């Protein structure tokens, strides 16, 4: 795998999103992973619906948290539509993917990145953007404006975002608090610690789609 991985300049991400006041970066985050993979597999860069997995998945708890995983696992059994079709209103509602009509896009399943492994981690950023959770409640990381993120932070992971990237000492996070926070929406965290948990707990949970 390379040196750097950037999967913005590959085409593969979507414009920065803004999850609001609601619980739902699991969706957030699924939804770059599946934008990433549509892109990587067809050609084509789509934005999918938050706000379908947010109402569908019902696993999750809408705007209470929820499981990218199982967001995941939604769209390779049904599928998922254009955030177009399904905009995101910032609070759950009803399923609506039925009177929506068909699906615009639908994966083949679901993995898991072996978890507290940087290697493992980084491999599955080199092949698509990977769904990925970390502790985001401590203030150092709310607050960040950029360079490379080293913490403080603890390990308590509470935040699902998005690793589109990485270079030799960091790994490249789309974060869903819209273009104003970070480097335009984005962080980088420092890797290569020897701390296996990661920073910020990095390595604790990690999903993909899997789209043959
Ligand atoms: C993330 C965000 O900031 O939007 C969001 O809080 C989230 O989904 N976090 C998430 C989580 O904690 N999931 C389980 C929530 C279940 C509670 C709801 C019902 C009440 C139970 N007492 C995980 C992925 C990131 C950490």
Request: hydrophobic content about 30%; glycine content about 14%.
């Amino acid at each position: 795998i390379p040196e750097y991985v950037d999967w913005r300049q590959k085409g593969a991400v979507t414009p920065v999103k803004n999850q609001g006041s609601c619980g739902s970066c699991w969706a957030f985050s699924a939804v770059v992973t599946i934008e990433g993979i549509i892109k990587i597999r067809t050609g084509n860069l789509n934005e999918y619906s938050e706000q379908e997995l947010l109402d569908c998945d019902r696993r999750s708890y809408g705007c209470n948290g929820g499981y990218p995983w199982s967001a995941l696992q939604l769209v390779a059994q049904y599928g998922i539509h254009y955030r177009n079709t399904y905009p995101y209103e910032g609070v759950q509602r009803y399923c609506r993917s039925r009177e929506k009509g068909p699906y615009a896009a639908k994966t083949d399943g679901v993995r898991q990145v072996q978890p507290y492994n940087e290697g493992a981690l980084l491999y599955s950023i080199a092949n698509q953007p990977v769904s990925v959770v970390l502790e985001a409640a401590g203030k150092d990381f709310q607050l960040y404006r950029g360079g490379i993120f080293v913490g403080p932070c603890g390990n308590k992971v509470d935040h699902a975002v998005a690793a589109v990237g990485y270079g030799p000492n960091y790994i490249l996070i789309k974060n869903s608090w819209g273009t104003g926070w970070g480097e335009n929406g984005y962080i980088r965290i420092k890797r290569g610690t020897g701390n296996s948990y990661g920073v910020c707990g990095l390595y604790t949970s990690s999903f993909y789609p899997v789209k043959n």
